[PDB]
From Swiss-Prot, chain B:
The keyword Heme does not apply. Keywords: Hydrolase, Thiamine biosynthesis. Its EC number is 3.5.99.2. CDD domains: TenA_C_SaTenA-like. GO terms for cellular component: cytosol. This is Aminopyrimidine aminohydrolase. GO terms for molecular function: thiaminase activity. Pathway: Cofactor biosynthesis; thiamine diphosphate biosynthesis. Substrate binds at residues 44, 141, 167.
Amino acid sequence: MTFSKELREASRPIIDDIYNDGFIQDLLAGKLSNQAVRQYLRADASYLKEFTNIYAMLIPKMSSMEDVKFLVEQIEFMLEGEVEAHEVLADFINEPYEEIVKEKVWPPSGDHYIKHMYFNAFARENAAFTIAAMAPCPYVYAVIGKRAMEDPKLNKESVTSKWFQFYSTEMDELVDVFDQLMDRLTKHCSETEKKEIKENFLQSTIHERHFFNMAYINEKWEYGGN
Amino acid sequence: MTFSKELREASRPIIDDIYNDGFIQDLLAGKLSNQAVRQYLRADASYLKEFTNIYAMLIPKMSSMEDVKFLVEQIEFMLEGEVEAHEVLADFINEPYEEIVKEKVWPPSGDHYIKHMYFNAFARENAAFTIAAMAPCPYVYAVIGKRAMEDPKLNKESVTSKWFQFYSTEMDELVDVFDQLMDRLTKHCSETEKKEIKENFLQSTIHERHFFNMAYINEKWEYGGNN
Amino acid sequence: HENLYFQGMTFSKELREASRPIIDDIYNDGFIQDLLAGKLSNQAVRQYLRADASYLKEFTNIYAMLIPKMSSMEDVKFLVEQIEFMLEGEVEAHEVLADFINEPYEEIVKEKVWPPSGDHYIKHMYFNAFARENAAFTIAAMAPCPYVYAVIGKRAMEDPKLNKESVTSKWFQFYSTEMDELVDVFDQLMDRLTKHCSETEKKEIKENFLQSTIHERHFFNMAYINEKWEYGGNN
Amino acid sequence: MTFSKELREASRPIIDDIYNDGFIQDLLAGKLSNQAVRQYLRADASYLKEFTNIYAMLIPKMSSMEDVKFLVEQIEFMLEGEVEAHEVLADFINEPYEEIVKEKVWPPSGDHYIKHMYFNAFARENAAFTIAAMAPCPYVYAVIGKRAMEDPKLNKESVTSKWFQFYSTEMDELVDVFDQLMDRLTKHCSETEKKEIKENFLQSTIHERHFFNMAYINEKWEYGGN
């Protein structure tokens, strides 16, 4: 199998754990707490802001013109905002998205994930290292959305069902581009480099698990100790 | 006087030197050599595309989402934008613009200029250091364009008069956008920081002087020796 | 005046004080408590040494990245001296733990490893080294290393629970004095470099220090419980 | 022919231009002006901290301990060592070295040179790109020194003959160290990468030409009229 397929396949057991965790389970059932939704939406916004800086930092690493335009198109898509899935969650908890995201939320797991993406963006000249760190985001969401649409436990009577419907189709184009880039950018990489890039992808899949759960448990930096 | 206006005012004596140099003087008269025009257009196209990276590098330094939109707009222009002034010079030498710019040209003076921008983008946290290295260009060209329109040496029978006409009006908004960006970014800078930022601006005005003159003298890295 | 001190404290003192409750938690956690007693498992020792060797390698790189941020040539000389010292090889504290488990140090530590907690700590130090111009941001991210170790070492030397019959007592003894110069230098640098920082910058520098103190707690606990990246299913 | 030897051979025509320029020719004759000597020594002293930064920036890029030790030893030498050739020039103009270097000098040609080194240190993960930007210096001085010792135009009665004598042998070990480092670090580089690394070396050889000439002509950033 190809490099990106190997990464995707290696990540699937972690995605199964995400799907079976409390955040996604409660969201599937249309019973996720207001607090978990709020903390997720607030954090998600902080993470997404950095995912955009990361795209910008990849521009100088690209030699191909098509790859640069892809990155710029992504930044523009991220700057437009108004993602239908966020509106679904905002509606679900009866708070406008504008009012919810006025309170910023890098809890510890977010800080780790974001600093993982930045480490690669600063330290590695080959964009594959950073792409591998960001790619689990759309892949995880796609797998979850598609699975939910065929899960007999999907609560179709809740507006939360539209969150899964959104991710079941809207990530595929981006997943395909990231796979093509990882496959192409790693052709001349050594086995030690490919191992590190693979690890970046698996770690980011774990970071995704921790990101949903961070919202679920209201994870905070506990500076007062015990 | 605001910081951005202080910088622009300080750059004026250098802009006067640029105006009186052979590139602009010969262009005013519609007498600039085809070689000088061709090399200038090649270098301009080569660096415009490279500036994409500098703008991209400043996106993470901006706290304002409107400043990020500005940077993304400039990237789009570097990638797929057209400048009517290019067509004017292409017509002047009777060659298609897209044929002229097939050959990339990276002279020693251009290397210095782009590495000045990169140093600031890499090394300095405050985007002002890099914005000050990029901002002189539109002001240099605006000053030249406006001055040329009232100059007795302007050859109005040559299509080159349209190059000056273009620059006399089409840079003013960008000069203002850069002024507001510099004033806001430097609101809380120290005097030492301001001095360094001002120096970046004056140096880049000199880099613009050399950008014209490197085309004028066909400046090359002399790797092969015998001077 | 009001710029230099907050509630009667310099900036470095404020940070140190804010971190102390976390250090108390570290001292009373299983890793340090077992080590105090000379009862820390051989497995925990090996896990600690492997991760710590990887951490110290990166700590050295962080010092190198601070050099261009320093305006003073005396500060550059201090950093170069620290790097030179790091390159001489094996911290004596590591040899003490190897002796405690009756194994040669070179057979214990063979490969690079950044377990989850170490990975976070290292990437936090690097973020600051790459992203922040003022060296204070990076110094704040690294300073809990010598500070935590100094506080623990000094506390242990006075603690009646210290097992003085075990060679592990020498680990605490080493840290009770060998970090003092570095703690002093880092405190001086933090105080000097933050003189003209905004309240927002100071808050972020302070959070870097407290985060790194939490990272120190997690680093010891990572070794204690054999924390590792779990890439398989059913976790 | 090794990669590093290819670079050095390619640089020779530039070094021939340097040797025939005013700075070296006047120095050969024992008549280089006091002002040129001071400006040269001041520039050399002024960039020492910047060169130190460049070496420090390469430490994290090295996989080998022995390469890290080399970089640290270079920094140590620069910070704590003394270059006898500086004392020879100070003696030549009858001014103490410590007095000459009280004033800093950062000319336009020096700004170009240092920004070329920094560009590479920041942008290129492989240290070879920056090493190639640094390595010409000792080779330029070695070639000049050895040529001077066989040149009948050398003023052997002037203390300046000792400057050429110093450089005729004191750079050779560093030239060799840089050779071996470039050969090792570029062993798996693409032809595109090698072309860029070679260009960095040739550009730095020209920067060394301008480092001497900027002292010779008292080059300045002229921010005012004319």
